[PDB]
Design a binder for this molecule. Structure first.
Ligand SMILES: Nc1ncnc2c1ncn2[C@@H]1O[C@H](COP(=O)(O)OP(=O)(O)NP(=O)(O)O)[C@@H](O)[C@H]1O
Ligand SMILES: [Mg+2]
Lengths: 588, 455, 453
């Protein structure tokens, strides 16, 4: 029957096999006696070059190879939320139970989803309806909050002849469609090739800001729902903490976290902590909205690339249902380095710094899969994918191909700084070099939704921080004493911005998250101290006296980050205490 | 001249080797008819004996070499041109993506085009008032010029190009420009910005657009600007239109060239770019200008992002060796709020002499331009000294130049993306700034101009 | 089946022709003309040819008159509890003139990846006895926490001191040290051997000793054999294992030599492009496993070439480990033992091993307060020496004095002095007592009352 190839060479994760004349580029293969998972990447006559997503130790020439006739795919259906998969979508907990091992073996094939679990399918589409790709025929309450909508798969068109509510496994046929080819049965599960972007109707401008709860991000460098943000930085600067924070507190529907070539403990930390972080509004834990893709640094190198596409394809699937999804990639540098390793094995001609010549276009194709969209289907529902990507440049030097190619396509840059991290200023975002091309439009959204002049507060705060940069160079020229009273007040206000607003401890119970309105009140209080103090100085007041008469109120400002969310009146009351204290000082 | 072979020998990335063929030609268009029913277009890169090396525009994923076939179509890649292209949107290969009716072509044109005979050229010399002072006065654009924008990631080159297209006018020509827009590997948001601006101004109804986005196959980027330029030369030289060609981002074009070059295992030039990158780029950018006796014209504004903001990278360096100047945006001016963030000192226009002066702009054009350049260069050096050594170190004359450079950046260059200055307003503002300096410092300007124009 | 078909020899690499049934990473044996046996590993296998690396090198091998034997399994370590107390060379052969180990089983020295689902997060205190580590950069069971050093700095003495003093307060007699020496000098080897033997640390240790004079491809195997022994002791025998490996810069050198012999294109600064991944296959073997009592803790030790932390070896190590301990030449010149600079040092997982029930309730607060005061005082010293004593404020002069005492008496404890965690925290309170109470903002006031005289 089916053609059986024969290994002729093994060198790390690169296998070459002859007698593969009937196979196609990008077909998945079972390689060797063990049948480890691999992918055909190029062919010269009957000899296929295969990259293997598992360890190849113990494999040699003469063993069989067998194409599956299908490209690298994911199973998409009920049972995918709250799971942790490896890079090729194998469920790591089932892996542990089936093999009865605490360690990762090979050659064992496990279905991605539970095909024996019973789910309640609620039919919502009437018989006789004409349907096409993306149309919703029913749903499953996978979680109490999240409806898993069952969509007609791409490439299926026809009229519904039989549909029935009931309890089914993901293998059972739940709907019958009459097509020109014939009658077609649909289950709750569809497969999709990870390297192909899931089709949409059209992209839309991503213009609604995401609420990360991180003050420096939401205020100064905001990302939108459907936008893309890069967070490049040296080791220990805080990339992973930033991503965990966004994963915990962002106001999206679903989070897909891809651990791409990083530490095993950090994946273990999510599966431990997320089920214990319970939403007070709905009573559901963070794990009830999360999908984990994990391929650690010492896991098969080629599976780092797989984990990226597995993650984005799952995100696109839930986007198509009409949800807002965030996908974190930690770290895209490890994916790029995997490409560089395989490129050397293939003896390709290098591009920049050893990376394949197609590095830039691969990165660009990945981020074009993020975005706000109109999904396919008659209802034209909208969903989005927000992409947050760590980048890990050697020595923290951002002038390297992965960072540079990423900044060509994303609109938000959170540049982490070594000096800030060593000074324990976290998040270590360099507020001078970082930027968000969404700032202006987000400013208009915020002004309208708060009914406040938020955009001008953000501008003034950034002006103060930029004047701190210039004044620091002037202190460098002649020292602090030469500076005017207004200059030294500016330094104090910027100091309050850095310490009472920008600095935010992800590990503190209150400080770890700051609501949109608490952010508004904190920044108003800080800038109000600036407004009132200058007015005093113009009225003849003295900066040193203003400082000595405002110790207690400035203490309140420094602690407003710890004020509970139900007590925000304690923050907003600070302003009038500021006025009264400074007015009394100029009187004295 | 059509031939069909089922003799594919190798499938490696974007390239395919076909053997046992005959009658195949260099640059011939081909179709791969895949075992699964898909049809993918390509081009013959090289032919020898019974073999032919081809590139596939849509890549080679899912191809079984043994049960696929290659059809050689007997002609090179062409664009079916027609006046009906106006107001339509095409993908990178000239296929419509706007759901409109397919074009009935007047004729089919090899998208490589042909070189204009140097003795048939008319020299570009008609002033185009962009409304942007840093361009009109210091780096003057003339109709038929190739004048690119050199930018960087995160910088507002799309706003600058949209502003130019929106405000550009030749003073003694009432025809609107026809706009040919070529998107090359750009994001949806980049392309949507141009789409929205063209719809708002109504320019979309006099535009032709070829859209290759970052989700489209990278090898298609190689054809996209040739499709655009072939459309442009048709509308200009056969239909008599004044065509403005905006192409972005040319760095993405160069990177696609390097992917093919690497797949072919060619001898890599600087930074892996092929040794023929200069020539290949010249075959695009020299497709601009005017022809003696024909009414239309082709003006090109390519846009590229300089990798690591480095003007000596091969892509900006070779582009600068080809084009007729360049408009450079910088991060330091952008961070200071300057809009557009044009740094005039490394910017240039090579066609400004015969496009300016009495009867074109005004008799004081070139002298005030040269004086403003010298005064800005001296003032920027003065400001650089003041930062390194303090304001007190600066001499009193250099304090004037440092302030001059501040006002130059803040009032002259910084005009806004929706501000349309006449050339007279621009030149008058140039004189207001030159008035800051003592008359004895204006060596570039002769006395009659100073007596006549200087306050 | 012995093959007389060696084709060529390139450095440590060897090509074997007319082979059949050979596997990637298979162990091989070369029988030389003089009769000695050299082991090796299949790096690449194609058609009827195999490419192998010889751990002891190819010098003195006449390939035409030597034969090759393929052994049908990867390189393994014969593990046994009797390895405790024994000294081995870089290839796992006895070095102490003691009997050959009778193994309980043989384990592929590459090990296997721990399933992330099966991992337990690092927890509970490891007392190194070194204040700068235990208080400010706490080592936790299952963590990877490296030492970044430089040539001429005393990382040798620090490694010995940690091996000698490390202990868990929680448990008794279940703590073991696995020590891997990589490319070290003969005198360095002498020093480690006598230290372990004279203190009795050898009686809870396993040593794998590769010396600079030894063949350098042995270094590839040495850390992998150490980690295989550690994983056995921890996960099959339930011990708390501390693995100390020095010097990892000598490990990278071996990788570079293999890369050169294979004519691979070099990566950044001449090191292989896969340097990060290769190091990850070592350092990620640390951790804990759910349902098993043991643990593997790692302290890789490396010298930063030219004291440059952006060099690929420290940079990539920092991108894998969970913090780092930095030794500096400035503190070493001042006589600070150990010369740990706490400002660039960090332990990421420290909070999992500190507080009431593990160390003491004041641990975290005094850590933050000492660190803040020390940074401020080091900055005060930086102004005073550069700008004179008079320019510094009166409050700043206090912080300068504090910083000096912090270095001279808190960090500088001596390479042969062990401090309990109580002694360290009490000493920390004695230093904070230099500062006025109005400056201890980070510490809660009831803690201040209780612990301050
Ligand atoms: N937001 C934060 N609040 C408090 N501490 C932080 C924060 N971010 C980082 N840190 C500290 O910095 C350490 C390193 O953070 P981490 O997110 O692991 O950095 P990283 O950039 O991902 N390191 P790496 O994976 O090696 O490139 C943490 O262990 C914390 O001590
Ligand atoms: Mg990290």
């Amino acid at each position: 029957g089916m053609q059986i190839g024969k290994i002729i060479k093994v060198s790390g994760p690169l296998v070459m096999a002859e007698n593969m004349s009937e196979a196609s580029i990008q077909d998945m293969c079972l390689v060797g006696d063990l049948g480890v998972i691999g992918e055909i990447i190029e062919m010269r006559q009957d000899v296929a070059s295969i990259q293997v997503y598992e360890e190849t130790s113990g494999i040699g020439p003469g063993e069989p190879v067998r194409s599956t006739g299908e490209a690298l795919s994911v199973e998409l259906g009920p049972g995918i939320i709250s799971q942790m998969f490896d890079g090729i979508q194998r469920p790591l907990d089932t892996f542990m139970e089936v093999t009865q091992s605490n360690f990762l073996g090979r050659g064992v094939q496990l279905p991605a989803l539970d095909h024996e679990k019973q789910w309640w399918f609620e039919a919502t589409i009437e018989e006789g309806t004409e349907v096409s790709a993306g149309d919703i025929i029913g749903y499953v309450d996978e979680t109490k909050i999240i409806q898993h909508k069952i969509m007609v798969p791409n490439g299926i068109k026809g009229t519904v002849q039989k549909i029935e509510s009931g309890s089914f496994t993901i293998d059972d046929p739940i709907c019958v469609i009459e097509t020109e080819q014939g009658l077609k049965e649909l289950t709750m599960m569809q497969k999709w090739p990870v390297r192909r972007g899931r089709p949409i109707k059209q992209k839309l401008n991503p213009d609604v800001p995401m609420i990360t709860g991180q003050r420096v991000i939401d205020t100064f460098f905001p990302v939108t729902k459907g936008g893309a943000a890069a967070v490049p930085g040296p080791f220990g600067a805080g990339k992973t903490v930033v991503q965990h924070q966004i994963a915990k507190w962002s106001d999206v529907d679903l989070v897909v976290y891809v651990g791409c070539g990083e530490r095993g403990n950090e994946m273990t930390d999510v599966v431990n902590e997320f089920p214990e972080l319970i939403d007070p509004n709905t009573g559901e834990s963070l794990m009830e909205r999360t999908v984990l893709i994990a391929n650690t640094s010492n896991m098969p190198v080629a599976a780092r690339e797989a984990s990226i596409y597995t993650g984005i394809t799952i995100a696109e699937y839930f986007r198509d249902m009409g949800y807002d999804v965030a996908i974190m990639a930690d770290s895209t540098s490890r994916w790029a380095e995997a490409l560089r390793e395989m490129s050397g094995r293939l003896e390709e001609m290098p591009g920049d710094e050893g990376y394949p010549a197609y590095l830039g276009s691969r990165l660009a194709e990945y981020y074009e899969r993020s975005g706000r969209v109109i999904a396919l289907g008659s209802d034209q529902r909208e969903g989005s994918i927000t992409a947050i990507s760590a980048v890990s440049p050697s020595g923290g030097d951002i002038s390297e191909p992965v960072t540079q190619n990423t900044l060509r396509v994303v609109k938000v840059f959170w540049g982490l700084d070594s000096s800030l991290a060593q000074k324990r200023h976290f998040p270590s975002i360099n507020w001078i070099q970082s930027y968000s091309l969404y700032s202006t439009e987000v400013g208009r959204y915020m002004d309208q939704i708060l009914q406040q002049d938020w955009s001008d507060m953000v501008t003034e705060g950034m002006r103060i921080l930029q004047e701190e940069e210039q004044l620091n160079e002037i202190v460098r020229l002649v020292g602090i004493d030469s500076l005017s009273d207004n200059d030294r007040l500016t330094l104090e206000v910027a100091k309050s911005i850095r310490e009472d607003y920008l600095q935010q401890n992800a590990f503190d119970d209150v400080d770890t998250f700051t609501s949109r309105e608490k952010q508004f009140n904190m920044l108003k209080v800080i800038l109000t101290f600036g407004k009132e103090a200058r007015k005093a100085l113009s009225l003849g007041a003295y900066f040193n006296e203003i400082m000595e008469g405002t110790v207690a109120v400035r203490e309140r400002i420094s602690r407003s980050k710890y004020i509970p969310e139900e007590e925000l009146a304690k923050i907003s009351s600070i302003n009038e205490e500021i006025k009264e204290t400074i007015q009394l000082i100029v009187s004295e | 001249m059509i031939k069909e072979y089922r003799t594919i020998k190798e499938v490696v990335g974007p390239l395919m080797a076909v053997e046992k063929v005959s009658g195949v030609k260099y640059e011939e268009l081909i179709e791969v008819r895949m075992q699964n029913g898909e049809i993918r277009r390509g081009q013959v890169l090289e032919v020898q004996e019974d073999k032919a090396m081809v590139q596939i525009f849509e890549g080679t994923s899912g191809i079984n070499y043994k049960n696929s076939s290659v059809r050689f179509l007997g002609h090179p890649l062409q664009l079916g041109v027609s006046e009906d292209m106006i107001g339509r949107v095409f993908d990178g290969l000239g296929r419509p993506k706007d759901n409109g009716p397919e074009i009935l072509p007047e004729k089919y044109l090899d998208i490589n085009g042909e070189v204009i005979n140097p003795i048939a050229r008319d020299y570009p010399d008609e002033f185009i008032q962009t409304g942007i002072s840093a361009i009109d006065h210091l780096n003057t654009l003339v109709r038929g010029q190739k004048l690119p924008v050199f930018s960087g990631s995160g910088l507002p080159h799309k706003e600058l190009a949209a502003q130019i297209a929106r405000q550009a006018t030749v003073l003694d020509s009432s025809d609107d420009f026809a706009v040919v827009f070529a998107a090359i590997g750009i994001t949806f948001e980049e392309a949507e910005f141009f789409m929205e601006d063209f719809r708002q101004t109504g320019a979309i109804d006099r535009s032709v657009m070829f859209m290759n986005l970052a989700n489209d196959p990278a090898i298609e980027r190689i054809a996209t600007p040739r499709m655009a330029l072939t459309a442009a030369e048709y509308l200009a030289y056969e239909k008599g239109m004044h065509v403005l060609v905006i192409m972005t981002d040319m760095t993405n074009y160069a990177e696609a060239l390097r992917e093919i070059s690497a797949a072919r295992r060619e001898v890599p030039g600087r930074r892996g770019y092929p040794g023929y990158l200069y020539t290949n780029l010249a075959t695009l950018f020299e497709r601009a200008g005017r022809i003696r006796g024909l009414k239309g014209s082709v003006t090109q504004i390519p846009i590229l992002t300089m990798p690591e903001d480095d003007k000596t990278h091969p892509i900006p360096d070779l582009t600068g060796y080809i084009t007729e100047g360049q408009i450079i945006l910088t991060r330091e001016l952008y961070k200071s709020g300057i809009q557009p963030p044009i740094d005039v000192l490394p910017s240039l226009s090579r066609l400004k002499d015969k496009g300016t002066g009495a009867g074109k702009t005004r008799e004081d054009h070139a002298a005030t331009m040269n004086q403003l350049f010298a005064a800005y260069a001296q003032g920027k050096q003065a400001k650089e000294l003041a930062v390194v050594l303090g304001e007190s170190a600066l001499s009193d004359i250099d304090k004037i130049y440092a302030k001059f450079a501040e006002r130059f950046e803040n009032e002259y260059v910084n005009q806004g993306f929706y501000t349309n200055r006449t050339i007279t307003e621009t030149l008058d503002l140039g004189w207001e700034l030159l008035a800051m300096l003592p008359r004895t410092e204006l060596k570039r300007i002769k006395d009659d101009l100073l007596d006549k124009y200087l306050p």
